[PDB]
Amino acid sequence: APDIPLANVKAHLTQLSTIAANNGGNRAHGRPGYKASVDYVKAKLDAAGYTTTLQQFTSGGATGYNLIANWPGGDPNKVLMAGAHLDSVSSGAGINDNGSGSAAVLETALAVSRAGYQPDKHLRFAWWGAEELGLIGSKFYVNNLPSADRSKLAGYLNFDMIGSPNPGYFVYDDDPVIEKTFKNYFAGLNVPTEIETEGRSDHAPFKNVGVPVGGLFTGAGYTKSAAQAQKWGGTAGQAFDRCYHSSCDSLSNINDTALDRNSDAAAHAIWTLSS
Numbered sequence: 001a002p003d004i005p006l007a008n009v010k011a012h013l014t015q016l017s018t019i020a021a022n023n024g025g026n027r028a029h030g031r032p033g034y035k036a037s038v039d040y041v042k043a044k045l046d047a048a049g050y051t052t053t054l055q056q057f058t059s060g061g062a063t064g065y066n067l068i069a070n071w072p073g074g075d076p077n078k079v080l081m082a083g084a085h086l087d088s089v090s091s092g093a094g095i096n097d098n099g100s101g102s103a104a105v106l107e108t109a110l111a112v113s114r115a116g117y118q119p120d121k122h123l124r125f126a127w128w129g130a131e132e133l134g135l136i137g138s139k140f141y142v143n144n145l146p147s148a149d150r151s152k153l154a155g156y157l158n159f160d161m162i163g164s165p166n167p168g169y170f171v172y173d174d175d176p177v178i179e180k181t182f183k184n185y186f187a188g189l190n191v192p193t194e195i196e197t198e199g200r201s202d203h204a205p206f207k208n209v210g211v212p213v214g215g216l217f218t219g220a221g222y223t224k225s226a227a228q229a230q231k232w233g234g235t236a237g238q239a240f241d242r243c244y245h246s247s248c249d250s251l252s253n254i255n256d257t258a259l260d261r262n263s264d265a266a267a268h269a270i271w272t273l274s275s
């Protein structure tokens, strides 16, 4: 797998930050900063050669969108998906929650095209709307995916909050092959990981219909323990993300090292699991 350039991921976050500032301070469902976020991500994918689909739904009286991006080619009967919710709460720009996962997934999709990769499995990336309303976009996708297409899914990888400023390195303890893939990447860095428990994200509708899932998380409102600060640094007794769901979930609310490592781990897992 390629090394995902941290600067490229950070540049997507800058664009999402400007989109929030240009649209009332947020990227929330039913508000213009969300569709503007979709438009940015979709244009990058279209230019890289993806087949993109805007999947519309209505929730709360307002139109929502999921953005689906299929990389042409690969085994139609073995589809590997990766995704991230692209909405924020209305209090702020949602840069860690979840610009971080959205940007890592986008940069991995662009890296596939830059590398000339032809995965054996068909790759499909997704950016979900209305996750903050209760997983509404990812539930809509799974609810509207015919059972014959559901059975073609080899896995769903989820990235939701992966740049927390006082990070831990959590790996979902779900499908064993996906989990092993992520833990192997972190072992090569000599960075320990822990099982995710803090978390309620967009892998749940896939997990609940038997699709193998996994993912990465760096923590939200829970407090980092003394033991976790000893293994990862940062500040014991402070939240992993002191700006969770806050107006201060801005460009300053990112730990570059965690964003870089989790973005690189995302690309590692997508390459490994697709061929």
Ligand SMILES: N[C@@H](Cc1ccc(I)cc1)C(=O)O
Binding pocket: 097, 098, 131, 132, 160, 161, 196, 198, 199, 200, 201, 202, 217, 220
């Ligand atoms: N989905 C939450 C943040 C979150 C990430 C990962 C897990 I696992 C659980 C929760 C939100 O959007 O606020």
Ligand SMILES: [Ca+2]
Binding pocket: 003, 004, 005, 006, 260, 261, 264
């Ligand atoms: Ca990198």
Ligand SMILES: [Zn+2]
Binding pocket: 085, 097, 098, 160, 161, 201
């Ligand atoms: Zn989130």
Ligand SMILES: [Zn+2]
Binding pocket: 089, 097, 132, 245
């Ligand atoms: Zn959230």
